[PDB]
Structure formats: C-alpha cells, structure tokens
Amino acid sequence: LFKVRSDLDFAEQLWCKMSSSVISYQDLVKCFTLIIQSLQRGDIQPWLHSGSNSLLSKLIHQSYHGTMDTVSLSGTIPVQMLLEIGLDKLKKDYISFFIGQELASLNHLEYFIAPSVDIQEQVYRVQKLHHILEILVSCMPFIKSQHELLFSLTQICIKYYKQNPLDEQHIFQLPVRPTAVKNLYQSEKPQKWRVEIYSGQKKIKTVWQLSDSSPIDHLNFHRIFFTNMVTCSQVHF
Amino acid sequence: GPLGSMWERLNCAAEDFYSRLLQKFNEEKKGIRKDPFLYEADVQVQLISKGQPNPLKNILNENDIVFIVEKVPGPLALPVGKARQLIGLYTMAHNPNMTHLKINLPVTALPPLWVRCDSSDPEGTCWLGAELITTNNSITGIVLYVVSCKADKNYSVNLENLKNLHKKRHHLSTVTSKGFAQYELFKSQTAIALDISWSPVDEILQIPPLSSTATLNIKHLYRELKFLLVLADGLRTGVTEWLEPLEAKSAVELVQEFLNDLNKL
C-alpha cells in the first residue's frame, strides 16, 4: 500500500473540490469570485506549500503581507487559474511518489516539473510523468520487490521522455538476472525458441526458430506451430 | 525505371540507389525524416535506428541499424523476384569490380538492407537481406540472407542436422551456438515479454539456464488528470468537454462551504 499525499494545502483542496464539481465557465468565475472577495474582505488566512507560481498563490501572498491586485476574472483567466492549481497539486503527487519510493531524485525530475515552459507544455509533461507510472504499474507484478529493477526502469523511462514525444512506438529494455525472474519462465512454454549456429564469422549463421504465432508481420497465411529459418551465402568480390 | 532494361547500367540504377540510401544513413546520423522514401512509387524504404521497433527482432538476435524495404500500403510484401532485384542493386552498388559513372568517392558500407517478400516462391521466402563484410575500411563481400517461414500442425528439427547443415554449407570444422527464448508475460503501449539468451545450446527447446543473459521487453484515466486535460483542451480550442460532476453539492456550494469552515477559526 503506497502512501497517499494527504498534506494538502488550501489551493490543493480547492482543486480537489472544484475538479469533482465544476461543470461550466461560470462555475469558475463564481468560485474564484467568492475566494477573491473572501481574501479582500480578509476573512481567511490560508496556508500554501512554498514554491508555486500560480496566480492564486500570488494573490494569497498579496492578501497576507499587504493588499491584492484587481484580478478581473474575464477571458480565459478563470480556466488558467484552475489549471495552474491542478498542475502544482498533480506535480507534487508525482514527486512524492517517485522520491518517496526512491525511484528518482528531485534533480532527475526537473524537466517534467519545469515552471518556465508554457502551460500546454507543462500539461504535456505531466502526461509523460503519468505514462511513466503506467509503465511501472504494468511491470510491478513481474518485478515484485526488485527495487533496483523498479529504479532502473524509472531511470531509463525518464531518460527516454526528456528527449522524445509521448506518441512514439518504443520498446524499453530492462536487464534482469534470470534468478530474479525464474518463476516466470522456467516451467513455462516459450512463445519463441531460437537456436543460432555460427563460428567466429558471427555474421555467418544458420537460424532455426519455433513460435506460437507468426514471427513475420507481412506474411499472409490466407495447435499450429510456426517454424522459420535463416540461412545465408557468402559472396566474395 | 532503367532497371531491367539495357539502360540500367547506362543510367546508373544501382548508383542512384546507393546514393539515395547514403543520403539517409548520412541524414539519420542526425535528422529523423519520419518519411520512408518512395524509391519506386510502389516501393518504399525506411531506416531503423535508435531504439525503435525493429521488425528483424522477431527472427534475429542482432538489433542493428537497418533498412527495411516494402510495398507501399500491417506492412506489405513485394514479390520475391522484385526483392531479389533490389538486393541485386544494393550488392552491385557496393561491389569494387563494378564500373561507376556518377560516384567518384570510395563507397561506404551502408546499413544492411532487408526486403519483405510474399513467399509465392517454391521455397517460401519471406525476407531477403544483404550485409556487407568490411576488412578495415575496405569492403570485401556481402552476406545474402534468406528467411523462410512455415506454419503446420507438426514440426521436425534436429540440433545435429542444423549443426552439419551449417558446416557443409560454409565449409567449417567447428561451430558454436547461441540460444534465445521469449516469454509473453502480459498482453491486452501495453505489452511485456521476457527475452533470454545464453551460450551454448545443447538441446532443442532447452530451458534457458540461470546463467543466461536476460531482459524485460516493454512495448477512464483517473478523474483529476482527466479534468486537467479537459481544461487544457478547452483553453486551446475554446470547447471544454466538462465532466459529469461527482458531488451533489454544486461547485459554488462546495466552495462557500469550504470558505465557511475556514472562517470559523
């Protein structure tokens, strides 16, 4: 049972509430109107986790130590405002998962966390963090209690997603010791079994393989076993 | 084009193929032109770099940089005869004994070339490949690979037969072996398999020993994140696909109620 981040601040609790109820733009205007007035009236003193660049946090600091800006909740500002609050809170969820499980350091995550990039790029990077968690969750049943396997996987995923878009077909390779994975294969019937015969000239080979489905995607076939062979010829110039 | 006709050598079919392909190797060593180039309107050619899915991984232990050639639209296969011509061009374009009319620098070894075939050929060829053999910088030969694939109720194979078959065919006295097995752990991104390889093989269907080398091969979201994206898209397009609410209290009530609680100390 992983530890849920429950130490939520005013902005984060706001996000949780509004994220389960808001159904229109006017919802956002009215919700933010009440909070801003509650602040200008000085009726509340909310706490924030340090280090947030959201408009709301700004407007809160200005309420505590001084007095606030005339915001004007027009155009897309009320959307923006909730989006910011959501980003902070979600980034902090991910940080606490990865740091807390010792899968990565704050330093490692910096790219995904970045404040400087535009709001759609920040959102996009949260989706990369999520996609990393999905990968981890997918493998957990198999690399159960192998913290270094979990760790490396997280590292190679981070490395990949700083440089690459989310939509690319990609195969991650995670080196694993056969002992750490014994039970998953030793009594199991393999989906493919391949013997390759060569000699010094490692390019020159004969290959036999058995598969329980077609190893050739373009092969049009119009319990079945699939067998295939690879043979070669040397040609000298 | 000039291919198959008297003007083939004359108009440089091979050299123009070798040049085209040299663009990509030289290109992809940086830019990744996400377009497989149309060599012959009906024939396209992709290079496979990085850690992208390699179609040859299904049948081979090596994961090298490689061209894949196929019929223009799963992927489609050229007739065997056509694939053999293309394997021919690639071979000649790298042959030192071949007169060159355009290319005036020594030819570089290009990534191996592989071509999807339709079988339809007595011996049921599904792939043809060509790989260069280079001594230092100097070329010397090519390996020509044939792949055939059969599906049946039965199968028969003998570790000794394949050992000899390799020995007879390539005139050799010793021979070693490398084993590989794949186990599908999870299907449905979303696909996980375990790849295991060892040396040497002493048994067909041998169970990979624990000293084998191995890797894990890895190929309604929750509401808060879904809401996030809803807001993001709305902001981008002006069309917000609001979600059904979870709470019976409206946004405003929940917020007012939140505010009430924070005023009471």
Curated annotation (Swiss-Prot), chain A:
Top-level taxon in the UniProt lineage: Eukaryota
GO cellular component, one term: kinetochore microtubule
Annotated keywords: Cell cycle, Cell division, Centromere, Chromosome, Kinetochore, Mitosis, Phosphoprotein
Any Gene Ontology biological process: regulation of attachment of spindle microtubules to kinetochore
Record's subcellular location: Chromosome, Centromere, Kinetochore
Function: Essential component of the mitotic checkpoint, which prevents cells from prematurely exiting mitosis. Required for the assembly of the dynein-dynactin and MAD1-MAD2 complexes onto kinetochores. Its function related to the spindle assembly machinery is proposed to depend on its association in the mitotic RZZ complex.
Family indicated by similarity: Belongs to the ZWILCH family.
Miscellaneous comment as given in the Swiss-Prot or TrEMBL entry: ZWILCH gene is deleted in a patient suffering from colorectal cancer with chromosomal instability.
Protein name per Swiss-Prot or TrEMBL: Protein zwilch homolog
The species this protein was found in: Homo sapiens (Human)
Lineage of the species this protein comes from: Eukaryota, Metazoa, Chordata, Craniata, Vertebrata
Gene field: ZWILCH
Included range, full protein: 339 to 590 of 591
